[PDB]
Amino acid sequence: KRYEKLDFLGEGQFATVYKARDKNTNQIVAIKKIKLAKDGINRTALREIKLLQELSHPNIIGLLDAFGHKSNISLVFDFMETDLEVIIKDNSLVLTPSHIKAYMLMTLQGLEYLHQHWILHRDLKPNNLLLDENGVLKLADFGLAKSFGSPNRAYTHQVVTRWYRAPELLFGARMYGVGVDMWAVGCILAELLLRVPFLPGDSDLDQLTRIFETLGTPTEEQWPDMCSLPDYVTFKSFPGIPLHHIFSAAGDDLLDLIQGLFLFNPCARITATQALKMKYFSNRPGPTPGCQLPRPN
Amino acid sequence: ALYEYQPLQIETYGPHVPELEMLGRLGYLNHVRAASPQDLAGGYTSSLACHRALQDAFSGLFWQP
Amino acid sequence: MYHNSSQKRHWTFSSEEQLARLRADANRKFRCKAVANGPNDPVFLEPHEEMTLCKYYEKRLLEFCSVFKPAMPRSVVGTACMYFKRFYLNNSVMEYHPRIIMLTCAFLACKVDEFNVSSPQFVGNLRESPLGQEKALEQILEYELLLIQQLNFHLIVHNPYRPFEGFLIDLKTRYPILENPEILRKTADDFLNRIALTDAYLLYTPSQIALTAILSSASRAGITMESYLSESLMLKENRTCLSQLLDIMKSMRNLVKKYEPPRSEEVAVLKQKLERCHSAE
Ligand SMILES: CC(C)c1cnn2c(NCc3ccccc3)cc(NC[C@H]3CCNC[C@@H]3O)nc12
């Protein structure tokens, strides 16, 4: 209640976001005030509160504060000027390979921290990748994030925005791991390289059709146990387009990163740690500093 | 100004946890339930459950307030 | 992960006398507020009486989560009990009744641990008239933000159960002197339950609590396990840490021994005084 409401930052199913000043330090923050019967405080708000109070990484959005009144709660976050979707859709911005390297590096560092603490973001997409004024990407929108690694808990499979949903989720995986995030990273990476949604399927079966058409229908040698998934339906044997035909400007190291991120086998799909260890990030050019990342203004 | 990976050192105030790929060849997976074929198809391997249990068992074992 | 959790950073205390001071401060603050609201009146409860009522209502919380349908996972029960302990660590039983706070802690624990229970199910687990169940739901929703504010918005609770499973895995794989460590489990489980009746959850790490339970089961079984601590856990190379760990486990065991259950006649008197205090709140 020490917060002066400056502007209106957005509206979404569960909440409304405003720019604000913290008067006690005169800071610019984003207040996510939760909207609304006989169920109490919104579970999305509680999920984001409980998970973001346990995480502290430069590339994960900081929950600066929280408060509220009867059954209506509001969460105080770092204010972010833009999200990666605005950079991707800004035809005036040129995404050099170094800028893509910087974005992927910050995303994978935030995701490595997040996965080391056994949390799946599970809603990764360019909107949820916010950029502060200093060029530091942060993961945001933890309303679907869930702790993984526990056999005793079943997870939903309708949980990642369809265009970035991994094939095990489209096939209906109830138990999964970091792959569902890393696939989305690949999709984000692909979109960073194409400036267009990589796999923009209209439905779940259309999403699977797009995936298999772009990358080949997976065999049981590529993805063992694939048929065990609850919603597995056999598809046409698409040859798939070679990645250098999709990403014409991608070097062989970037193609190796992309291929690792897009493995159909969620166990063989690279994690954030080993994605960060790949030679793509070690090679030249170095990732651009945050102060030099492109700013959609 | 090239990136070099750093293993992201975080202090667990407890004993060393064996690495996730070390777990099977050190015999830990003999003592956890094997992942079902659906769980393997999703990316759950029971190395995750074993690793998380071992990490929680050692997280702050040597820590005092 | 506990080692950088808010539980470690804010809700693990140096000694049981800091807990006593916090609770005495809460009792004193309610007294001072009520006197400033309209001093040595016997209507108030003394901090040890508040402690007895907190122990009694903690036990009722365990019972409520025991008979809860659908079956409540043990992590939810632990989370609710931790919430109850923290709330009444900084709050008076005379201001917020422990029955409604008990149910509110269970409700918030169910939401926080992703145990998707609809509010009608939750209040259907109350052995009451349906009108009383709706009244109890209204009170639960009324107090929920209050609980979250009194927890300082730290909702993740690290229980000793997962570290218990991890220690059992580690004993099976690395400590072959102990054949079938699962013989410990039940007895260790019992000791773990006893630790939950004490203030250990606010004083020790969940891994220390789990290790104490396992070693106490083993000692109760006639099994020595200094070799597990020193060589298997590599405390042979750091004797200061081994001494610290053994002291922690010894003090946890003593803190379990000096635990006293709430006496039924004492609790009846204190409950009547509590109702008198809340009637004239
Ligand atoms: C709540 C918090 C994480 C936050 C901090 N800054 N900020 C801004 N800033 C303005 C803005 C405009 C356009 C694109 C991105 C950001 C907008 C915003 N909108 C709410 C959602 C919308 C979808 N993407 C994730 C956002 O949190 N949420 C936030």
Numbering used by the authors:
A (entry chain J): 10 to 45, 51 to 311
B (entry chain H): 244 to 308
C (entry chain I): 1 to 38, 42 to 284
Any passages from the paper?
The human cyclin-dependent kinase (CDK)-activating kinase (CAK) is a trimeric complex comprising CDK7 as well as cyclin H and MAT1 (1,2). CDK7 and cyclin H form a typical CDK-cyclin pair, whereas MAT1 is a CAK assembly factor that also regulates CDK7 activity and attaches the CAK to transcription factor IIH (TFIIH) to promote phosphorylation of the C-terminal heptapeptide repeat domain of the RNA polymerase II subunit RPB1 (5,6). In addition to its role in RNA polymerase II phosphorylation, the human CAK also phosphorylates numerous other targets involved in transcription and the cell cycle, including other CDKs. Therefore, CDK7 has been identified as a promising drug target for cancer treatment.
Using a 200-kV cryo-transmission electron microscope without an energy filter, we have now determined the structure of the human CAK-ICEC0942 complex at 2.5 Å, a resolution that allowed docking of ICEC0942 and analysis of the molecular interactions that are formed between the drug and its target. From a total of 6985 selected micrographs, 10,904,715 particles were picked. A homogeneous subset of 205,478 particles was identified by 2D and 3D image classification and then refined to 2.5 Å resolution employing recent data analysis tools, such as Bayesian polishing and correction of optical aberrations in silico (Fig. 1 B; Fig. S2 B; Materials and methods; (24,27,29)). Our structure at this improved resolution is highly consistent with our previous structures of CAK-ATPγS at 2.8 Å and CAK-THZ1 at 3.3-Å resolution, showing the complex in the same structural state, with an active conformation of the regulatory T-loop and the inhibitor bound to the active site of the kinase. The use of the higher-resolution map in combination with density modification in PHENIX allowed us to improve and correct the backbone geometry in some well-resolved areas, showing density features corresponding to backbone carbonyls. The density for the inhibitor is clear and shows a hole in the 3-hydroxypiperidine group within ICEC0942, probably because the carbon-carbon single bonds in this six-membered ring are longer than the partial double bonds in aromatic ring systems, which generally do not show holes at this resolution. Analysis of the conformation of ICEC0942 in the active site pocket of CDK7 revealed that the pyrazolopyrimidine core of the inhibitor binds in a very similar position and orientation as previously observed for CDK2-bound ICEC0942 (45), forming hydrogen bonds with both the backbone carbonyl and the amide proton of CDK7 residue M94. However, we find conformational differences of both of the six-ring-bearing substituents of the inhibitor compared with the CDK2-bound structure. The orientation of the benzylamine substituent in CDK7-bound ICEC0942 differs substantially from the conformation of this substituent in the CDK2-ICEC0942 complex.
